[PDB]
Symmetry: C5
Subunit: 310 residues, 5 copies
């Protein structure tokens, strides 16, 4: 029984983050726990305060026509507790619920793990005898609470795209709204735990350039190589399978290349020194001592530029 | 309370993908979030002047006879929210709910990870005093909304098989409808993370063909074998146990054969060269230097043709 | 209000498999999704169609006395949606529901992974003013559906055991029924992924019998040993801890023994060869080249017979 | 509306284990599926059979005052099926439900994996206006079904502590009952999968006592040590973090000590034998050949006695 | 419809811990099972005992107005079981429910695993026709049960912060209450499973200082480095990614540094000694023999002071 109107019905929306948590990169989901607040004109609910007795009268959801607001990018239907309903004299309805949902928003891993992300919560509503369009009351958005934390990330800002994408679907009109939680990853821990160990075992690997022991050099380069495969696996598992190339995915691959050519070099210099050609062998190795670090640093300049430098 | 039955009751169906997600290859399941739309006329509901109050009015599920539509290949009963019910002047009812389900559809892994799949959602309806058959209205199907993504996959098409399978079951006849979501896997990340590294360690394996140090050659070939075993494990765990052979299963197995014969050879050349036959030893190893890559490349040609080329 | 009869009430049962899936060997559980069909006579519900108006009438569960059937070997109570209730003129009630549950049935791992299993679904009912016995109607126990698949398994047959187990419980008598779905495992994928790799790494181990290189033979034997531990762990984790010995458990163990006496031999031939006794060492070694394959093939014949051969 | 009493109300309890399963050593939880039987006199319910149709009449839960009995050491409130309620003429009520709960009882891991455990189910009832005390009818306590099995454990006995702990809580008194399910771990599988391999690689380690090859002795001892760390990890993951010391925890730690002094010996004999001091070196090694197994066997007797022998 | 008020309604609170469990460090959550006790005056409930029959009357939650108390840092709405409601003649209501929830509270990992934590449970209530303030009755908060155990942790205390935080939210005010469960972790098992083995393989690593065998020293240092990579991984995974530096993270990283400088050194001493400079090389290792343990112990004093010494 929507409010009988001479005009299209605006439902005012606002979301107060109380808790957000469980950002799942493999799933590309996160879990949020918040207030949802709705506001609208139902003049059928208009009462005269003085004669009816009181400043606001309160119903239970069963009593009133309430718009069916739905989350678009949500997995299973939301859980909500209706915290309050209030009608002001002129028929102004104040709805307040507390919900929790895991919403599904895609992620961009190209600058992983130095990425920043923008999570979206989309509210849609579907019209009937009066049409519904939604819009945002920014004072009842108040952002998040000041204890709101998302483990492993920095919350940059929580705002809403002020007013909606209105479109046709299955013969009726729908109005969609976009609330946006921007986060930046805390990359710190990747450094002592992933990047630096990788670097170390790579450097250890080419330590085989001030050596002339084939019988040992093979041992070195393949040891370090194994450890790097372990790191590749460790990293790969806690990420989704992306159709594009990431920054540390790039680094990791580039490293496999350095290991392969290192192996090649090692092999060549040994073949040479058994072909009674120690001059040319030793000069290849001395080249490598300069080549490998320099071409590495260069490749990394190019690479970092290619990812972040645009 | 079935509808006055002058005819077999047609229920018009449609599914609108809002979200699909969590394709589980070990499970052969995926999760869908969609509009389900049902429509039929119940002439008992027919009132048809705009009289005495409204053009079309809305009842709630408990007031009306609703065909009980069920998904065949789902795990638990679906979780559904009824979005609206509208009854038309001759009692033409349009039912709209929003559900989420994890649907269970088999997958074909033979051309993994270059496989494509066609997921199924099967709807049955079951009869009584009149017979029910289902069918599809394509406006209320239109597939996905074009924001639908399934991580790690490209969504090709969402269609429905227009004609139902109407068949006998126990007491009464049932009507089944087949909606089909075709997807193709995004193989990109498999190359830098699995195939290329696999290849590299196989090649480093063959580097022992330009060496005569048994004591180190063994080190080489068993090391690389180890990393292959690790890769075999990594890949194999995250797939189900298929009764058939997959493409990268074929590849991985072939690679085992190459490692085993490599080892055999290494052993042979050291045994010969301690059995005082360095001519024949050096000729067998040098032979292998050409042999192994070529038998590898053509074996892969045979294999690729054997899989994709048919 | 149970049906007042003369003496003991037969409630006719039938189960139609719709989906079965998620066999968990560590849990020894699996998930089933099926029709449950019940039938019994309540002569109080008997109506004659001439005066009552219709050929058969249908109630809702609260309208009728319905026997409460329960599954014995189930984790949490199955949850079901009732498809229909029909009473025949003579008071014959035909009940039909659709349930899904994970039923808990034990497994025999002695011939893993070449095992076959017999899954059970047990139905219980509890009596009062009339005695209840359950029995099976085979015509609407039309078995299973032909799209029914259980991943990694072949479904051999689905039938039910015709006479119930009637016994005293909590001082009233209960009636129990046994439906049993026999499956046989699909071992195919175990061969290229576990067994053949196991064998290979074992043979590569025995390559140390054509080497006089301790310095390397040690490398060979502990390397392969390690890979065999990785395979052991891999196989072992996806199994429960059985109080008995499994077939591949036996194999894996025997393999450990082979690795140990191999190490021993290597140790011995090196000590002999430095103890200035190359004669007995080399003859011990040539012995081993013959012994190890032969005692392996023998032990495996013995074992294969010991398990499968009785 | 409790039965108005001239005395404290005894509610008679009994629990019938139908299924038990999912013992979690990390969580220290397990899952149970059982009958709960309650009984009390509500003299207000007293009816005499002479008046009405039947000797005992049956109600449904909403009609009657039913005591709220709760499991104390359970995670979330149990979910139950009320199977039957019968009031006998003297107003004697027999209540029967079938529940499933995962109950939380601590475990003692000191003799792992040769420990036995005592699982608990605690029932409380909280009085009001009259006193409620719980007590046990052993005739209605089953112990278990004759098919009740708990994977990886031997179920010894299910009994109950007959007199309750009745105590003050938040100003009213509660009555607690303690049911005790005794189990013994089935350790068989630990021997072929964990204990014996672990020992073997320890022995293989000690092969370096018959070697005099530093490069190979080192190869040996670090290889074996690697596998022992892998085993330590393997075991450690499936146990919780106890403030005390477990048995295989002790053994495993001891083994680490053996590997360390082993390495020390190896390094020492190499150093002596390069200090042109083969006398001292070879005599230390010959010593170790006897020393290591003996100090091991002793350490292990002292250990076992220290654990099980008290 | 709160009790008509002349002034702010105080709702008196209390929490009795029955079970707490599943402390998750990656999630930074834990699970609790407790009594929640609420008490307030609603004078509309005032009764004459004599005329009405009973000194205290008990309702069920629907009959009465009950204040909506909600938990702030919880994931989903708690699951609650309402155990009692008792009203006193003067309209004083005693509410008692048994709830279970996983509450989300942040953790400080800087002194891991020698950290202590203060877990929080925050209760809020929100106002309407009258305002609610919550407050704590310390007796109905009679601490914890002394069978309350938290695996892997020692429970220090359970208390409540006596004064509420009363603040404005969304145009009406809320009253927040802070209960604090202080725990300290049980570090015992970290010593035999992580710290000592790490130390052992680091020492085993430094045995390469009494060895001029490059060909083996590489073997030593990189094998131990490998196992230490495994320890880093093991430890790291069971912790969340903190933006800051932890204590054992600090240690593990320092250890990587020691490995790198070790490799550097063995590499240089070998390079020197094949570069025909045996005096100074041997003096570099003789130095290292003292240097590495002493700089290690010194760095550890500085680090431990840096963490715990504040
Ligand atoms: Na080596």
């Amino acid at each position: 029984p929507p409010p009988i109107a001479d005009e299209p019905l605006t439902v005012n929306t606002g979301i107060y983050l109380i808790e957000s948590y469980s950002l799942d990169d493999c799933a590309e989901t996160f879990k949020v726990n918040a207030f949802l607040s709705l506001s609208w004109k139902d003049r059928r609910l208009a009462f005269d305060p003085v004669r009816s007795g009181v400043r606001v009268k309160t119903y239970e959801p069963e009593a009133i026509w309430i718009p069916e607001i739905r989350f678009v990018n949500v997995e299973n239907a939301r859980d909500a507790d209706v915290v309050d309903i209030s009608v002001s004299p002129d028929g102004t309805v104040q709805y307040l619920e507390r919900f929790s949902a895991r919403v599904l928003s895609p992620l961009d891993f190209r600058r992983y793990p130095f990425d920043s992300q923008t999570l979206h919560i989309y509210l849609i509503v579907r019209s009937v005898d009066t049409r519904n369009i939604v819009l945002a009351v920014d004072l009842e958005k108040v952002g998040k609470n000041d204890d709101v934390f998302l483990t492993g990330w920095d919350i940059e800002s929580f705002t809403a795209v002020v007013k909606p994408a209105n479109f046709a679907l299955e013969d009726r009109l729908e109005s969609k709204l976009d609330y946006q939680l921007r986060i930046s990853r805390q990359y710190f821990s990747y450094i002592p735990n992933i990047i630096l160990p990788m670097l170390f075992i790579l450097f250890i690997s080419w330590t085989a350039f001030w050596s002339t022991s084939y019988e040992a050099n093979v041992t070195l380069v393949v040891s370090t190589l194994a450890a790097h495969i372990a790191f590749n696996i460790l990293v790969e598992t806690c990420l989704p399978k992306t159709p594009y190339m990431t920054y540390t995915g790039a680094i990791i691959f580039m490293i496999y290349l350095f290991y392969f050519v290192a192996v090649i070099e090692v092999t060549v210099q040994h073949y040479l020194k058994v072909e009674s050609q120690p001059a040319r062998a030793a000069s290849i190795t001395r080249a490598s001592r300069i080549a490998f670090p320099v071409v590495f640093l260069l490749a990394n300049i190019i690479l970092a530029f290619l990812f972040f430098g645009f």
